[PDB]
Design goal:
Layout (H helix, E strand, L loop, with lengths): L14 E2 L10 H8 L7 E2 L19 E4 L2 E4 L8 E2 L1 E2 L2 E2 L6 H8 L5 H9 L2 H17 L7 E6 L4 E6 L14 E3 L3 E6 L3 E5 L11 E3 L38 H8 L3 E5 L6 H11 L5 E5 L2 H14 L5 E3 L14 E2 L6 E5 L6 E8 L7 H10 E10 L23 H8 L4 E2 L2 E2 L4 H11 L5 E2 L7 E5 L5 E3 L2 E3 L1 H13 L7 E4 L2 H10 L4 E3 H4 L4 E7 L5 H4 L1 H8 L2 E9 L2 H6 L3 E2 L3
Parallel strand pairs: 14-20, 14-21, 15-18, 15-19, 16-17, 16-18, 19-20, 22-23, 24-30, 24-31, 27-28, 27-29, 29-30
Antiparallel strand pairs: 1-2, 3-4, 3-5, 6-7, 8-9, 9-12, 10-11, 10-13, 11-12, 25-26
Helix pairs in contact: 2-4, 3-4, 6-7, 10-15, 11-12
The structure holds zinc ion (3 copies).
One zinc ion (ZN) binds next to loops.
PDB class: viral protein
Keywords: PanDDA, XChemExplorer, viral protein
Assembly: monomeric
């Protein structure tokens, strides 16, 4: 039972038995917790429970010290000291925010606000408690027993009675049985097996209830500012391609960590890979939460960095297909590309963490715990999409609360800002600049005269809760006949069910706003589907329209965002 207090560090025998993570609490702060919350079970070497035979008193406020043993008011000896007295819980070696993190259900937005505005050790306790709460929540749903196999990609599932059914998006990876991870999409459901196997009828599926490991390292290491570039050696022969980031590559070597806010197409990948050409001798580890983000960094490194010193780290429990053009798992190559969850135990001169709005504080801590670097660079954009908070149902999570890095980028500002968008037609750049970047994002391209908006509410149908708007897809089909150049367009919408219906009717490649992040396409057709808080979220709206290089057609439901779009309006 030896350990240190998660609130003030004062070493103690005490742990909270009612807390799902069982934190070490000191005599002072343990009392301050048990007297203010429903949490009264206090654990030590031996728990704080009445030692009298057959007595079920476990509330520490109802217990006393019988010399060296513990008893309740009904069994205590004449000479007994109350366990809960004078602002202390008796133990060895002798809080409003801690109580609110320890007792919350993580369904409200204020829970996530507090998990980011609290002290650094409370940010880790909150990150640990949240991830554990998310995992024990998997046990809640019902099992899916296969009823019929249509083909190599299609099946019919039978669900467990009494227990609710989980959302069937690629976001929920069902570990199926021992055959491996499997995902689903809509009585005809499409089965996405990671490991190709003859899906037998009658087989069952149970959700991935993984174990939450304790957090040791902070979300952000303590900041350090240096007078000269430290441990890094720059080139004087530095390519003119990367000359626009030279002042910022120097800022990187003159701080322990630095933040870079890069709106869509402002050159984040270019900045990240150019940092390697500026410090050519430096060992750089490129990390991000998603495999697609690490893959986008791999594609940029393939064009500028020597392929022999690059290595793509893939966890042997390989979930889905990723970058195949580097040597796999050579954990010591100068340039290492790896997701946060697969990070090995190593050191680096620079660590680059990309798509920082997708990181949680749990991921921020894991990176600091597995990688020990001279320099840490956080690239991303708080005006883009955050990680899905699968328990959160009440309130909206603002960008300053995505993680510690976004919190800094939104309060004190980012250390570096990429201000020129080189991807989008000016109509899109002018719209998102005013919408999320306070007019500091400039357009490099001219207005393409290929950005259109149509105000069309249509008809909203629901496949469970994922929305469909067939009349909006019908408007797209009517537009495509008259504008056949748009045949090459990617169809984007805030819902998978809308995308599924549009893929059958239009035939265009389909992408949700969330999965479109980091990618770019010449033409984008976007149907807003509904006027919900999800389809109206300005960060998702920002991602959706900033995917287009040449043109975009937005069929809108919200008068607010339709009026804000600086596109040519269309009739019908
Ligand atoms: Zn304490
Ligand atoms: Zn507790
Ligand atoms: Zn008793």
């Amino acid at each position: 039972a030896v350990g240190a207090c998660v609130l003030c560090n004062s070493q103690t025998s005490l742990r909270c038995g009612a807390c799902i993570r069982r934190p070490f609490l000191c005599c002072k702060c343990c009392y301050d917790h048990v007297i203010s919350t429903s949490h009264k079970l206090v654990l030590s070497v031996n728990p704080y429970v009445c030692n009298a035979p057959g007595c079920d008193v476990t509330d520490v406020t109802q217990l006393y010290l019988g010399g060296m043993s513990y008893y309740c008011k009904s069994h205590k000896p004449p000479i007994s000291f109350p366990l809960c007295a004078n602002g202390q819980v008796f133990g060895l070696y002798k809080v409003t925010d801690f109580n609110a993190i320890a007792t919350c259900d993580w369904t409200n937005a204020g829970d996530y606000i507090l998990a980011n505005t609290c002290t650094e050790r409370l940010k880790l306790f909150a990150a640990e408690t949240l991830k554990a709460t998310e995992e024990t929540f998997k046990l809640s749903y019902g099992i899916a027993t296969v009823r019929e196999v249509l083909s190599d990609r299609e099946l019919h599932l039978s669900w467990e009675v009494g227990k609710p059914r989980p959302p069937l998006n690629r976001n929920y990876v069902f570990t199926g049985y021992q055959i491996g991870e499997y995902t689903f999409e809509k009585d005809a459901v499409v089965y996405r097996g990671t490991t190709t196997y003859k899906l037998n009828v009658g087989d069952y599926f149970v959700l991935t209830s993984h174990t939450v490991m304790p957090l040791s390292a902070p979300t952000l290491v303590p900041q350090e500012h240096y007078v000269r570039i430290t441990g890094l050696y720059p080139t004087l022969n530095i390519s003119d391609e990367f000359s626009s980031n030279v002042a910022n590559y120097q800022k990187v070597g003159m701080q322990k960590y630095s933040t870079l806010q890069g709106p869509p197409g402002t050159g984040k990948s270019h900045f990240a890979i150019g940092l390697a050409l500026y410090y050519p001798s430096a060992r750089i580890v490129y990390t991000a939460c998603s495999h697609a983000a690490v893959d986008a960094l791999c594609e940029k490194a393939l064009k500028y960095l020597p392929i022999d010193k690059c290595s793509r780290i893939i966890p042997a429990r390989a979930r889905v297909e990723c970058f195949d053009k580097f040597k796999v798992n050579s954990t010591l190559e100068q340039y290492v590309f790896c997701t946060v969850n697969a990070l090995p135990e190593t050191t680096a001169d620079i660590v680059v963490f990309d798509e920082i709005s997708m990181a949680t504080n749990y991921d921020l801590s894991v990176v600091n715990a597995r990688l020990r670097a001279k320099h840490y660079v956080y690239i991303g954009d708080p005006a883009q999409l955050p990680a899905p908070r699968t328990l959160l149902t009440k309130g909206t999570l603002e960008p300053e609360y995505f993680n510690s890095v976004c919190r800094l980028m939104k309060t004190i500002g980012p250390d570096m800002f990429l201000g020129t968008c080189r991807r989008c037609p000016a109509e899109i750049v002018d719209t998102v600049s005013a919408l999320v970047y306070d007019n500091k994002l400039k357009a490099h391209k001219d207005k393409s005269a290929q950005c259109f908006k149509m105000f069309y509410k249509g008809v909203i149908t629901h496949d469970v809760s994922s929305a469909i708007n067939r009349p909006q897809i019908g408007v797209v089909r009517e537009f495509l006949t008259r504008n056949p150049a748009w045949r090459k367009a990617v169809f984007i919408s805030p819902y998978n069910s809308q995308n599924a219906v549009a893929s059958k009717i239009l035939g265009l490649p389909t992408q949700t706003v969330d999965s479109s992040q980091g990618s770019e396409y010449d033409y984008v057709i976007f149907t807003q589907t509904t006027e919900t808080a999800h389809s109206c979220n300005v960060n998702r709206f920002n991602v959706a329209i900033t995917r287009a290089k040449v043109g975009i057609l937005c069929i809108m439901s919200d008068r607010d965002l339709y009026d804000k779009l600086q596109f040519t309006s269309l009739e019908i």
